[PDB]
Design a protein around this ligand. Structure first.
Ligand code: 8T3
Ligand code: NA
Ligand code: NA
Length: 372
């Protein structure tokens, strides 16, 4: 507990392509790089020679594979994947020294799913069975892990945003954060659902009814780049962000993520851009805490130094993607139905401002903030 030197730095990735961990499937073990995704619940791997893939799961080579004789078609708003379900033995080489029999969707056909030029070949959905496809009877990887081993029911993520970080499976590594962890309840075990109770731009409250902030849910999701905000909250937030930075002018298309903005190298004016704070429901009645991120988190480098504005409007509720998570060490404390936040020891900041996790604050009617 508290120290897992072998799992430190077990995450890799490239800007814009997410964070992946090395996994092995089958016997003899086939090594695959697998996207870490707290926003879905399927363990799904390329199983056929798609041209974007460095490698793929060759079921025929594994003696331990078992067919479930069942398919699954998974559409997303963007693209889709289809696959054949089965189980096989799975390990994480830079994780616990264990091997589990896990469900695997062997992806046979996909569209707008794999990233051309990425170094990952599947996805590890770390959320709950409730959102598993085709249904909640398909046991997610982490459930199998905890059922079959002595690994404690929790994991933590340090996303450092070329990119890298750590996934600590079964515990917490105190070297990965500074100060104290603050916990928010997991409202319901499907996505990692939480409740935002107040939002500030540069310490200035949006003063929206807090139900708007969670319309229709707020989740913590490592498989999404942006901080996504419900439309109505997004509108107020940009309005306030534009004002806080009106010292400079940018095309309206920029704020809508329709064009990049660029500066002469080493001259990105971080200081004109405001901090963004989310107050989250605390563990105690009428107690909250807040997390603060910098323009370093929401202004994403793209490759002048060109940046994309990564706060975007949503119709699926608030998504705390990599923009939020890169600022923090995040503990998915499944055993206690709570999520912990602490300032990440690796987060990008400057000499004037850092990410922050602060509490306690007194916040009333926090239960009214959840959409039903
Ligand atoms: C499974 C899903 C998903 C995530 C990804 N994620 C990424 O490509 C990605 C890119 C950059 C980052 Cl920082 C994280 N993830 C790709 C495909 C995909 F289907 C679908 C919906 C996007 C939601 C999610 N978390 N996972
Ligand atoms: Na166990
Ligand atoms: Na620490």
């Amino acid at each position: 507990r508290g120290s897992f030197v072998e799992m430190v730095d077990n995450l890799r990735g490239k800007s814009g392509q997410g964070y992946y961990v090395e996994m092995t499937v089958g016997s003899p073990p086939q090594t695959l790089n697998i996207l870490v995704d707290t926003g879905s619940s399927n363990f799904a791997v390329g199983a056929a020679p798609h041209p974007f893939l460095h490698r793929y799961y060759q079921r025929q080579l594994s003696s331990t594979y078992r067919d479930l004789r069942k398919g699954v078609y998974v559409p997303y708003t963007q693209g889709k994947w289809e696959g054949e379900l089965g189980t096989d033995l799975v390990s994480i080489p830079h994780g616990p020294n264990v091997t589990v029999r896990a469900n695997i969707a062997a992806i046979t056909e996909s569209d707008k799913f794999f990233i051309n030029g990425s170094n990952w070949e599947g996805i590890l959905g770390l959320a709950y069975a409730e959102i598993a496809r085709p249904d909640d009877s398909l046991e997610p990887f982490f459930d199998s892990l905890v059922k079959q081993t002595h690994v404690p029911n929790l994991f933590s993520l340090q996303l450092c945003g070329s990119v890298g970080g750590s996934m600590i499976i079964g515990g917490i590594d105190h070297s990965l954060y500074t100060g104290s962890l603050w916990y928010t309840p997991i409202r319901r075990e499907w996505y990692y659902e939480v409740i935002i109770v107040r939002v500030e731009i540069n310490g200035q409250d949006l003063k929206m009814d807090c139900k708007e902030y969670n319309y229709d849910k707020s989740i913590v999701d490592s498989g999404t780049t942006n901080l996504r905000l419900p439309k109505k909250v997004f509108e107020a937030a940009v309005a306030s962000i534009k004002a806080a930075s009106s010292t400079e002018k940018f095309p309206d298309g920029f704020w809508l993520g329709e064009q990049l903005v660029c500066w002469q190298a080493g001259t990105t004016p971080w200081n004109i851009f405001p901090v963004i704070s989310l107050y989250l429901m605390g563990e105690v009645t009428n107690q909250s805490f807040r997390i603060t991120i910098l323009p370093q988190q929401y202004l994403r480098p793209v490759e002048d130094d060109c940046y994309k504005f990564a706060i975007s409007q949503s119709s699926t509720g608030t998504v705390m993607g990599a923009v939020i998570m890169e600022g923090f060490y995040v503990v998915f404390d499944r055993a206690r139905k709570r999520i912990g936040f602490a300032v990440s020891a690796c987060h990008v900041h400057d000499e004037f401002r850092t990410a922050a996790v602060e509490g306690p604050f007194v916040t009333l009617d926090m239960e009214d903030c959840g959409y039903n």
